[PDB]
């Protein structure tokens, strides 16, 4: 096996095989989240995709017993992605990163004063939308927008 797949895992043995989610923002994720601080082996590249060629399944991402929303969590940086399963006989039913409501440690009150940014925290921001996506900041009760935040 000169690079690829061989998604043999599923319990006591796992994989993860992020393959360019949207593009060049899946690296992010990587730090954006753990998932490299961890035993199981990993796999990626850049699909420079259009998706798939001849017949394209109609999905992508990672597969490896994340949790439930170990995601929902990406809802924000790669909403358009998709987890796990198996090609002959398999399980990971209609599962899409679907807004969490409270990103956790990834981000940063852009507010200059939040104590956030001064000590031993947690980024915890809460999410509401109808507008264009809203994020509050238990800390400094202030509201910024997926934007300007996403960056920082």
């Amino acid at each position: 096996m000169t690079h690829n797949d061989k998604l043999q895992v599923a319990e006591i043995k796992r994989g993860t095989v992020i393959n360019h989610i949207p593009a060049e923002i899946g690296f992010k994720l990587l730090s954006l989240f753990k998932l490299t601080e961890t035993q199981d082996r990993i796999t990626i590249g850049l699909n420079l995709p259009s998706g798939e060629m001849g017949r394209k399944d109609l999905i992508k991402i990672e597969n490896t017993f994340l949790s439930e929303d170990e995601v929902d969590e990406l809802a924000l940086y790669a909403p358009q992605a998709t987890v796990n399963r198996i090609n002959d006989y398999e399980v990971v039913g209609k599962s899409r990163p679907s807004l969490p409501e409270r990103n956790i440690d990834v981000l940063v009150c852009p507010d200059s004063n939040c104590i956030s940014h001064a000590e031993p925290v947690s980024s915890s921001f809460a999410v509401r939308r109808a507008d264009d996506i809203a994020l509050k900041c238990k800390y400094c009760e202030k509201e910024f927008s997926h934007n300007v935040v996403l960056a920082n």
Binding site: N113, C114, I115, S116, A118, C140, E141, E143
Partner: protein
Amino acid sequence: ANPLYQSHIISINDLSRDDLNLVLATAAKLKANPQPELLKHKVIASCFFEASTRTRLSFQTSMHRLGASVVGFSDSANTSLGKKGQTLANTISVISTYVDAIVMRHPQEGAARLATEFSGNVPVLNAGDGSNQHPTQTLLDLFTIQQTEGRLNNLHVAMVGDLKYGRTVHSLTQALAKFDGNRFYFIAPDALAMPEYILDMLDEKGIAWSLHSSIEEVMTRVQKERLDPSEYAXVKAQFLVRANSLGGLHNAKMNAKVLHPLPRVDEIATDVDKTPHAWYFQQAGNGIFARQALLALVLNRDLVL
């Protein structure tokens, strides 16, 4: 057994009708029926991360009319601790240790929250995060509205000031708002305008309002007044049409009253002082009651209702 127990108080938003109607009424009597020793054997923390004094001087006095203690400090100078190293969350974790409770004030804006987390079971009172929240103020304000007009229901309110950076009309409003159908008036000079969020919320909800740059008519169909302050920030030739000044000829009065979480300066005139609608003060003296209520709720388990 009390709703309030060991709960940390920190943001008005984060509190429920009920709750308000409670500190609201535990303080009403306390006011008619004081108790020194409800608290004896208690010590509290009067942490003045950001010196403040009007607020501190009243907090405190509070601790002691209930009977009790203090240990605290005001800062920005000859106060120590950690600095170029230590965490407001090391301060607390130790503090936490001997104290029984913590009023505490600050420059930054998490602190009370930031301190919650690290201070296990020792409730924190927030005298201020920063430019964020002052629950004590607005409940202080809220009541007082109450002993006056005689209800927090079916009112004629108006808050003429610098509703923009206005720290307290922002709370007031949304507490005065939880209750219902009351119409608010906002005599603000398009610059101390009203932020477009506390509104979409008036709107958000089911509530109402209007705009004017007078103190005038808005004023006859009006019941309690919040004049904020007006200052720095804006030019000093920005104190151009400072016309939103409360003074004396209003007569086209009613039997309302005027308030201002001090400290007045220009906002309003000695001339007024005197005559009804005045109170800015009583408004103050009523914080000694508003606080207490809390602290004994905060720290006791039950009541002599």
